[PDB]
């Protein structure tokens, strides 16, 4: 339906394809890598493994650990000085998914034009980025294989959002060995923002029959496997479902888009820089139910993808059973109660709304609303 | 066990993708174009078509229309020397997977050198094909999204599969507008190529989450809509489904592998010069059959896909209803009866189980067989 697929022309998955990949590095004519990741993944040791594994390989690196969450113009330019220092010939991000937006951007620059800006948009740039490889460590972005690169301007205090499929990472990784070690409460958030990305995707004015099928699968296997791998972050099945799950998430979301779950969820974690994982899950079950009176019929098959008992159901009372599911789950693996408990104020809502819906993942929900419509909408997740 | 998913990083699909994928190659900074096709499609007019497009954009282009069924070395060679003479900066293959390999090849050896038979067996190259853009028309052989390059040695007679992460196209075109002019013959048999391709998908050895869910979709839209598609080719809404059901059929191929039916259909081709998809149409029951005995619940998961009303049958009992469903569908739309109309003759069935059991594809069928199982699995079929 006049659509486009976007993806990585490899990605590697499972328990040893870290190593899998970065021995296929090999022969390949690169001599300097530039590892951009953050503080705790250089702390920890996940970045020496790395550079090791490519020293193994006869490629050397050079390491930027100075992404935050939610990255920065002054990052990018950060990793571009590092880069050129070094005379890196390619790029690995390593880590969730800041690192990724920050490496995208870091090799698109390397080499195109000047500046990020001049990149905020739609297939800005007429160079491919330098060859970037994306090392995924959480279970819920998919970062590591969408062509969307978001950069906050501290300055305009702004985000922009660089949507080109020259950012698309030209090998994803993920390697469930890099997640075993999430705490409980990191793998229950990026699970829930994965689980967001497949009703979101599911629910889109731009889904397709691909991205229909892969947010459905995505949906069962975190219902299948979320709650496991957060009571219990050594059980290797439940940790590789859902690096597969959170993948297929990102199948979907990277073309069909997302919607208001996300619209509203970048406003909080944007203002008030919260993590991003969390808002969306707290979110969700509230607009779905908004949703609901849109796309019930769609719901109940996102509630029959995640094995539950209602296939038998109208519509409504399937969207229903599915929302009260969604909010189970939730509260089974700690997420917040409401945005009360995420330190929201009710009188930032007017302009938490109207932000919301100048959004570019509001065009897609199923459901377009005016400035009370959200405004309530917001209230209600209170 | 770990995996690799393998796919193009950007797929153009529906009305309408035909424009885009050639708007976009505007300050892409290729001016000259080789396309590869074949009689048909130069004689009808598409190979005008897609070349007229070029031209609105600045871009030159050379045809090569020598391809035919099976694409052989030849037919190679004399394509690069088209590329030579004109010193095509990049490659268009137009036409069903004939084109489409016929065109990988190329590609591969234009940035290469060498000879075909150098690259057979798996990532033998040591560079990126020259870039490659896939027009696909018909629908069922998703080898415009595939690593698989399938070249047949005249000379020899000698099917030669390269199976290379670098012939993937850099981009794939499913634009239905393409598909309409399809006979009810060549949907027919594309169609059963990729349900074919479903089945064997999920039935091997290889499959993963990701696999599986491509596969299963893929049987669902092709039960919903090949037999439209056959009976009123002008149904744009059912060659559209049709388009997609034969890509996610690729997306589960190209990765998971495939079986016993294509390993015995490309023999039965590269010896009698049969279709492709006809050989595998005829083939596939007898072979699903087959393999019931070992993957008989997972044959009953794509029956469910398909809607048959089996979900409360037992495994052996659901098994047997899908197999019994495609032969339906196959008489339905007109696929012969068995191997004695398409020209097979009982006396070379040795040769052919011989090389059946030496083709790649036969490595992920879920059960292994010997010389004497493949000859009377053969015969079964007359
Ligand atoms: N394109 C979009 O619209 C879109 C969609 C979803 C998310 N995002 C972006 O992605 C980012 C969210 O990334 P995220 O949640 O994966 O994490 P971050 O938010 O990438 O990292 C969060 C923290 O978890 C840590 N961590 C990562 N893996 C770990 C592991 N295995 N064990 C222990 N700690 C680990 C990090 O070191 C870090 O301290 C944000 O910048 C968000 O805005 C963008
Ligand atoms: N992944 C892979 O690499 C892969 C997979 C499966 C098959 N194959 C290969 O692909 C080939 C099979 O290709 P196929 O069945 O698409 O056809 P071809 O075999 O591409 O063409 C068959 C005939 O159909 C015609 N045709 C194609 N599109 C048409 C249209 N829109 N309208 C009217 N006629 C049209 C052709 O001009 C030709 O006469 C085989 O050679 C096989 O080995 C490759
Ligand atoms: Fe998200
Ligand atoms: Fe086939």
Redesign the interface.
Known sequence: ?????????????????LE?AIKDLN?SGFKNALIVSDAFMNKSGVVKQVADLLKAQGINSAVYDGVMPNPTVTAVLEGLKILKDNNSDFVISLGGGSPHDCAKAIALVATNGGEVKDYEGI?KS?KPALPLMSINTTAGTASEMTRFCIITDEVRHVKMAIVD?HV?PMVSVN?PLLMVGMPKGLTAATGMDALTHAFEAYSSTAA???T???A??AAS?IAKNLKTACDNGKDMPARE?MA??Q??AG?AFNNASLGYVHAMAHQLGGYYNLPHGVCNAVLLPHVLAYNASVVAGRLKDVGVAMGLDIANLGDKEGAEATIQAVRDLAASIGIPANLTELGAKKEDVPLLADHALKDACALTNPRQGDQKEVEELFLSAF
Chains 1, 2 share one sequence.
Request: proline share 5%.
């Open positions: 339906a006049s659509s486009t697929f976007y993806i990585p022309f490899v990605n590697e998955m499972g328990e040893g394809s899998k022969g297939d007429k499929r698309t390697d397709t029959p691909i229909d099928a892969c459905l699968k296997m479902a597969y799950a993948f297929l199948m």
